[PDB]
Design a protein around this ligand. Structure first.
Ligand SMILES: O=C1C[C@H](c2ccc(O)cc2)Oc2cc(O)cc(O)c21
Lengths: 195, 194
């Protein structure tokens, strides 16, 4: 239906962040959003389905803010743009929050854990890997597996940032981001360019 | 010495149960059976107590990590270090500590950075010393040792910490050697003389 749905999502996100997923009840969500349990369960048949809707919405959205790298832009420039958008999504979006909420469930909801992984981090690997296939086909990178190589690129460029963010110590200027990206990219190319 | 270690353990218990902010020096003194006089004589503040806990726990986690010896062979040294490094992630040895700090939501930055510098950055510095020996022996090339140590650890760690924290990792010994070999292969393609 209508406007109470998006009020329900926002009310639920707030409670999941402050209290965790299992600690938040559909009862509390209904109260916070000012709907009957009838209206709430008509939109989302369970708490699990609600969190699933939230994961898929945020991950589909983060995926749209990511360029599709074109080799016509230059190899270095393509990878530098992708890296830059990838780190911006980390800093300015809910990935770390999602992981904190699921990690706090101590393995109770594996189906939600996998849904987040496959909609987000694995989706980002697959998008980069498609582009790394194009670049290997153009004989300008060499590697055995594109998914393996996409994971390596993202690991290099990401470094320890997710831990710094979770500890409240990531406070890195745009200039500091370009340095992280340049170092990861330099190293990826040292390993994958024909030599 | 005498009292201190009972106070440390009593405080660790309360920090885990209740969190750092929620725990009072009053409760720590009660739990350890000392006067507030005795407690404040050993420790200036709650912040100082947590600091002693971080330094002790990080020095201890650091002792479960080899010192890589170049005399053992480059690949073998790195493979042993990588293996012991990933064992820390798999047995969730940092997890409780990090949950306590992360739950303070950036209210205690000096404690957060002391944990970072005493633990994860300490691991980078140990590896960087070893990569300097290897560069001096002309069997790796790279511009900055700490940059290179961070890259090695990033490659070998990959996605594993995320899979573990989400409860989607259960790794056989054979799967760990494959993670290490892939990271090591890549690191050497980039740093070996060509
Ligand atoms: O793959 C990683 C690495 C990171 C991490 C890095 C260093 C460390 O010491 C602990 C954790 O944890 C994560 C947390 C995330 O939200 C997303 C991620 O992709 C990761």
């Amino acid at each position: 239906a209508g406007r109470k749905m998006d009020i329900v999502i926002r009310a639920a996100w707030q409670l999941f962040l402050e209290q965790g997923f299992s600690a938040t009840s559909m009862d509390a969500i209904a109260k916070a959003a000012g709907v009957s349990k009838a209206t709430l369960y008509a939109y989302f048949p369970s708490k699990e389905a609600l969190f699933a809707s939230l994961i898929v919405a945020e991950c589909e959205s983060l995926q749209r803010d990511l360029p599709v790298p074109k080799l016509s832009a230059g190899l270095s420039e393509a990878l530098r743009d992708f890296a830059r958008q990838y780190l911006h999504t980390f800093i300015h979006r809910k990935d770390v929050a999602f992981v904190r909420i699921i990690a706090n469930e101590s393995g109770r909801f594996p189906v939600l854990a996998r849904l987040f992984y496959e909609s987000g981090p694995e989706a980002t690997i697959r998008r980069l890997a498609q582009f790394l296939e194009e670049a290997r086909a153009a004989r300008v990178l060499e590697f055995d597996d594109p998914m393996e190589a996409a994971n390596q690129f993202l690991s290099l460029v990401r470094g320890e940032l997710p831990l710094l963010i979770v500890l409240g110590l990531s406070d890195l200027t745009e200039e500091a981001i370009e340095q992280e990206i340049e170092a990861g990219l330099k190293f990826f190319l040292k390993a994958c360019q024909p030599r």
